[PDB]
Design a protein around this ligand. Structure first.
Ligand SMILES: [Mg+2]
Ligand SMILES: [Mg+2]
Ligand SMILES: [Mg+2]
Ligand SMILES: [Mg+2]
Ligand SMILES: [Mg+2]
Ligand SMILES: [Mg+2]
Ligand SMILES: [Mg+2]
Ligand SMILES: [Mg+2]
Ligand SMILES: [Mg+2]
Ligand SMILES: [Mg+2]
Length: 1105
RNA sequence: GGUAGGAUGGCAAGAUCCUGGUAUGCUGGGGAGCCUGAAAAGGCUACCUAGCAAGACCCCUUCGUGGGGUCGCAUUCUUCACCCCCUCAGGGGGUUC
DNA sequence: AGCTTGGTGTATA
DNA sequence: CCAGGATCTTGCCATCCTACCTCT
DNA sequence: TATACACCAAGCT
């Protein structure tokens, strides 16, 4: 039943939102707002305290499971080896707590003459070592571990610290020796530092390394006289570790050849391609204009750059010595950002990094690889590229030379450049061949080699294809639902408009400062890269650069604790921790002393420093604040000042708060990816154009069409001075999308110019033909938006999570309690009974014909009957037997021999009883644990209606009135509520207001509310749908900054959020005209009952069929 | 020309996962020291050991309430229903008020 | 006596 | 916390291609 | 361009 019309799609992506608009147009004027909805999503986020997505939490849990599985297999293999050697592994019980440690100590100290005792001690020591083997680089092998210095420098520092601390020198001073000695000498000592939430000093400060444990194993072997084959087998069994792997399907594809993976940066084809392309983009000044390099010129430059052992040829060197130009500046189009004193000409041209590193490794390891050195000298570039590609792809989860195994291991240990380039190896070789044989650049080489035209673009993903990024996937799912529904309603759009998260309206001072910052970062990164490569670190990561920078900035001292640190034992602390959403920006990164980081844990810094006697908050603040800016460092002067301020602000925080920095990076990815998929849709559906505009253009357009969100949605002012932003009303996303449907490139030019002139500061109206035509076309848009807002047509909707997947229970296992049969049983004790059969039989004792337990938690339900017996289906419990109880009177399930609290509620089942004119309502709050122990997490189960047994936590902790009404036959399930369901109270609004809710509804008469949770058995948590919690939170922040700049309405909003309406269920569902609104993708409520969730009124909803 | 978009390379700042590890933590089983107690058993500080979503599927086998292998918290309208796409009944997608 | 509000634990680095 | 692999974004520089707009 | 919920306790009419 599609009714075709000319309409435009507007897409405004966001981190936790997306505004979508279908706006029908006659000629170029907006005619009708067909749909306007702000969809509020979670951005993929689970466990809202941290910003960690559900995907990230699933990956972390899966990898913990994989770690534990591999550990079980590895310890089983070690157990088989120990049985082969006749060495007794450490028993699970009835041994001394220091048996393994004293075994390690004695085997390191003295030869054990008794052979049976010696083998028992060896088995104890080796099994315990494999349980506690310390850390090594996962990419390194057993030979690499054996080649590491033994023991590590960290253990030598630890050992001299312990020798000074305890005034004794154990010889040779192994980890097992020191731990056994300290557990005997200072009983109750902790070995490794833990979270400090009483508090004594630990034995060790830094992370244990596998070369320390290996050195202890060698010491034990030398003292006990063990054979070398036995020691080798024990080393390979103890220190066995799975190689990290890269799944090939997560590698991107070549756009010019989609059957081929993208090539690595190590590839010789890429090195030559990069050199040739960079040379082909160079230009020579020829008569107030530029010409490309001649064939001999580019051949000379390319051979000079390819035949380089070291990066020593600058662009000035290429201009002066290779091209023999009269002037340094005669070479134009140098691919560098220029600076003072010809910085761009002093930068280095590209070279062959793989060939240079392989030549250095051949020259440095001549004795190790004579066969490979001769093979590399003999063989040409194609076979060199084949072997280099094999070494680059060795890390992929899915060598053409009969080489010795030691040589093969050595050249598998060589670090080549990492990272994927845009094109495959085949494409790079073909483009390089065309570029060198002809005199052409990459574009003409692409046209020649692949037969593409000047209009060619790389292939785009389709709408149904996810990216794997959770924010982007949320935005994409909502957009594709909206577009499918809108195409069925009105046909394909004439044009699609996407807002990109880009902006360039900055002052000249800001652009100059950013350029200076880029220059300083590049110079210091190059210096630090050179130093780290001189320290045997081929490719420093950004974390490596930050680590070296902070080690130089604080002169190798723990930032918090002041203790001396090295590269090996230091840690990079998130000052705001990861479980608080803390970013990896370097103002959140502190270099720490290992123990110092672990003792901080996940607590905020000022609270931890107040509790701890290791650090002082003021000492850390003065240490950060006395940093003196040297002229030649990574930061500029203003960047250094901002960095110190940000670090001090992160150190000063006392309560667990989220990260203050909002990253726009997910929003930009969502905009770009959704644009690409909308382009694919438009190619499949004949859409005229997918246009893109920046968000500053959208803001400017709203400014010059007199589109004020507060006037549009009748919002009282919240600030004393100025006007509040659009962030107060969530409908602004949809309004942005509507405004985006009006934009043209010329008027975007005009509005961007107006924005740049205004930000470099009344005011003056823009003047341009595009601007005048756009004002004439969009004169009525304000009236359309006022009428649409007056009809309550701009929906704010949250998508529902109906799948019963996620955390089945809370992660903390808890000890069970006990209670004797013959004692007196209160209501809470009967409600906490673990076993369903014992709970059901006690239920039948308290109420014989009953199927539910209706107890008040404080009433004394059963007296102390000394002769009470329960006859189970398989046993009889007398009065002396203990009944296992859950530790607390809250919903809990039995998991793995312990008790776990239920997780958050998946849904609530709405039950209604009483008369039709005054019905009573209650919620059966249902969690994932309820469906798990009910057997409802299986195929073919409607989880919202499938019957739950009475011993589930849902029915145990349902309200007493609900339990009585369900057993009396009066209460029936008439619907269900999930978090994110919309409660629309109608035009009559909320009438049961009492207290602060009345004061809130005085200024904000909100009729649309979002179910956020079910905090107890009688209550539902409702926040207003249209009002944003972030506006009220930044109000609460800014209230402590300026005197009384908030309006009374803004203050009442600030006190209302974030707890909002903690509402009684019987007061909410007793509203006549209240409806539970389940919207379609277009924001329209679903009232027809099909196979999707539909709207329903709790007053007159039918009992469930 | 200017703006905008897209390519490739470089640089800078970040985001998102993925693989492999470490150390704690929790619970069960222990116990080295100390303390409270003992004709009257538990705590505290550590350390050892097992497990760390409930569970699902496949094979044992020198026949068992276990041994082994691969997995299980993402893809937000579960399940059902209809339609679509890619893979042989698996996965993904849409369903207009 | 029953709804109004305030504090707090939750696996982590 | 650690190493390190993959995907992507924003900003700047160089080159190539596209569409679009506005003053001589 | 974003950032809790479920449990436990007080608490003035
Ligand atoms: Mg926007
Ligand atoms: Mg392991
Ligand atoms: Mg270990
Ligand atoms: Mg320890
Ligand atoms: Mg930390
Ligand atoms: Mg928006
Ligand atoms: Mg432990
Ligand atoms: Mg231990
Ligand atoms: Mg398991
Ligand atoms: Mg579905």
């Amino acid at each position: 039943g599609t009714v075709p019309v000319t309409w435009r799609l507007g897409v405004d992506v966001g981190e936790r939102s997306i505004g979508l608009a279908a706006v029908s147009y006659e000629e170029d004027k907006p005619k009708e707002i067909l749909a306007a909805v702000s969809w509020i999503h979670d951005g993929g986020v689970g466990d809202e305290r941290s910003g960690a997505s559900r995907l990230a939490l699933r990956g972390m849990a899966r990898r913990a499971r994989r770690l534990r599985r591999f550990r079980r297999a590895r310890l089983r293999d070690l157990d088989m080896l120990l049985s082969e050697l006749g060495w007794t592994p450490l028993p699970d019980k009835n041994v001394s707590p220091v048996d393994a440690w004293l075994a390690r100590k004695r085997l390191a100290e003295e030869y054990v003459v008794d052979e049976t005792e010696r083998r028992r001690l060896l088995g104890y020591a080796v099994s315990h070592m494999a349980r506690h083997r310390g850390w090594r680089n996962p990419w390194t092998t057993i030979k690499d571990l054996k080649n590491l210095p033994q023991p590590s420098d960290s253990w030598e520092r630890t050992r001299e610290s312990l020798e000074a601390r305890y005034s004794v020198s154990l010889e040779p001073g192994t980890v097992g020796q020191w731990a056994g000695y300290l557990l005997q000498r200072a009983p109750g000592i902790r070995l490794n530092p833990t979270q400090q939430s009483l508090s004594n000093a630990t034995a060790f400060e830094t992370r244990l390394r596998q070369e320390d444990v290996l050195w202890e194993l060698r010491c034990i072997a030398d003292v006990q006289g063990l054979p070398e084959d036995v020691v080798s087998n024990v080393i390979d069994a103890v220190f066995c570790q799975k190689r990290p792997s890269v799944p090939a399907e997560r590698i991107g594809r070549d756009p010019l050849d989609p059957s081929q993976l993208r090539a690595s940066r190590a590839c010789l084809e890429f090195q030559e391609y990069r050199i040739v392309a960079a040379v082909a983009n160079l230009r020579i000044r020829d008569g107030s204009g530029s010409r490309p390099l001649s064939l001999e010129e580019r051949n000379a430059v390319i051979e000079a750059l390819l035949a380089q052992t070291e990066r020593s040829l600058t662009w000035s060197d290429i201009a002066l010595e290779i091209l023999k130009l009269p002037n340094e500046s005669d070479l134009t189009s140098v691919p560098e950002e220029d600076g003072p004193s010809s910085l761009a000409y002093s930068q280095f041209a590209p070279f062959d990094e793989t060939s240079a590193r392989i030549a250095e490794f051949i020259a440095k390891n001549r004795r190790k690889i004579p066969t490979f050195a001769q093979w590399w000298q003999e063989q040409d570039r194609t076979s060199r590229s084949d072997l280099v590609a094999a070494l680059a792809d060795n890390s992929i989860a899915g060598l053409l030379v009969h080489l010795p195994d030691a040589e093969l291991e050595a050249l598998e240990g060589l670090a080549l450049p990492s990272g994927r380039v845009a094109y495959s190896r085949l494409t790079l070789s073909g483009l390089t061949r065309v570029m060198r044989d002809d005199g052409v650049d990459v574009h003409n080489a692409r046209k020649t080699c692949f037969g593409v035209d000047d209009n060619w673009r790389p292939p785009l993903p389709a709408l149904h294809e996810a990216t794997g990024h959770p924010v982007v996937d949320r935005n994409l799912a909502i957009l594709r639902k909206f577009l499918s529904s809108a195409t069925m309603r009105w046909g394909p759009p004439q044009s699609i408009v996407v807002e990109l998260a880009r902006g360039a309206s900055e002052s000249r001072e800001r652009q100059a400062e950013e350029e200076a910052a880029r220059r300083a970062h590049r110079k210091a990164n190059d210096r630090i890269r050179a130093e780290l490569r001189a320290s045997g670190l081929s490719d420093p990561s950004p974390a490596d650069l930050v680590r070296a920078r902070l080690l130089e900035l604080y002169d190798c001292h723990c930032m918090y604790c002041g203790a001396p640190i090295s590269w090996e034992n230091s840690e990079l602390d998130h000052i705001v921790p990861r479980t608080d959403g803390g970013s990896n920006r370097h103002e959140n990164l502190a270099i720490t002393c290992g123990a110092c980081n672990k003792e901080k844990g996940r607590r905020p810094f000022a609270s931890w420093a107040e509790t701890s006697n290791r650090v002082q908050l003021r000492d850390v603040i003065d240490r950060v604040q006395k940093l003196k800016y040297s002229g030649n460092m990574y930061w500029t002067r203003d960047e250094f000042s901002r960095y110190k301020k940000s670090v001090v602000a992160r150190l000063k925080r006392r309560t667990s708060d989220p990260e203050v920095i909002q990253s726009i990076e997910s929003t930009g990815y969502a905009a770009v990816a959704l644009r690409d998929r909308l382009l694919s849709y438009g190619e499949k559906n004949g859409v005229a154009q997918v246009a893109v505009f920046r968000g500053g253009v959208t803001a400017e357009a709203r400014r010059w069409l007199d589109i004020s969100i507060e006037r549009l949605f009748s919002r009282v002012a919240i600030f004393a001075q100025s006007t509040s932003t659009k962030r107060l009303d969530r409908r602004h996303h949809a309004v942005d999308a509507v405004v985006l449907t009006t934009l043209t490139p010329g008027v975007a030019k005009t509005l961007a110019d107006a924005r740049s002139r205004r930000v470099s500061a009344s005011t003056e109206e823009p003047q341009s033909p595009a601007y005048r035509q756009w004002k004439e076309s969009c004169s009525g848009l304000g009236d359309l938006l006022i009428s649409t807002a007056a009809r309550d047509s701009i929906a704010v909707a949250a998508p529902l999570r109906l799948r019963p997947t996620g955390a089945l229970h809370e992660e903390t296992l808890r000890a069970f309690s006990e209670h004797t049969v013959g004692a007196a049983w209160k209501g809470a004790e009967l409600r906490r009974i673990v076993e369903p059969e014992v709970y059901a039989a006690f239920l039948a004792l308290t109420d014989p014909g009953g199927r539910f337990l209706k107890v008040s938690p404080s009433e004394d339900v059963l007296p102390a009957d000394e002769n009470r017996h329960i006859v189970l289906s398989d046993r009889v419990l007398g009065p002396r037997d203990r009944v296992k109880l859950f530790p607390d009177d809250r919903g809990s399930i039995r998991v793995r021999g312990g008790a776990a609290y239920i997780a958050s509620f998946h849904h609530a089942r709405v039950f209604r009883w009483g008369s039709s004119h005054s019905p009573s309502f209650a919620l059966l709050r249902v969690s994932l644990a309820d469906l798990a122990v009910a057997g409802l997490l299986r195929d073919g189960v409607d989880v919202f209606t499938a019957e739950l047994p009475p011993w589930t936590p849902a029915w145990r902790y349902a309200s007493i009135a609900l339990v009585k009404a369900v057993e009396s036959g009066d209460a029936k399930q008439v619907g269900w509520l999930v978090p994110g369901d919309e409660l629309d109270f109608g035009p009559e609004g909320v009438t049961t207001a009492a207290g602060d809710l009345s004061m809130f509804l005085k200024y904000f008469p909100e009729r649309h509310w979002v179910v956020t949770g079910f905090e107890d058995d009688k209550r539902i948590n409702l926040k207003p749908a249209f009002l944003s919690a972030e506006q009220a939170e930044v109000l609460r922040t800014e209230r402590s900054d300026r005197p009384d700049t908030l309006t009374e309405a803004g203050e009442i909003l600030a006190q209302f959020f974030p707890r909002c309406w903690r509402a009684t269920v019987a007061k909410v569902l007793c509203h006549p005209g209240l409806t539970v609104i389940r919207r379609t993708a277009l924001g329209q409520p679903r009232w027809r009952r099909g196979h999707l969730p539909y709207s329903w009124r709790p007053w007159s909803a039918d009992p469930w069929s």
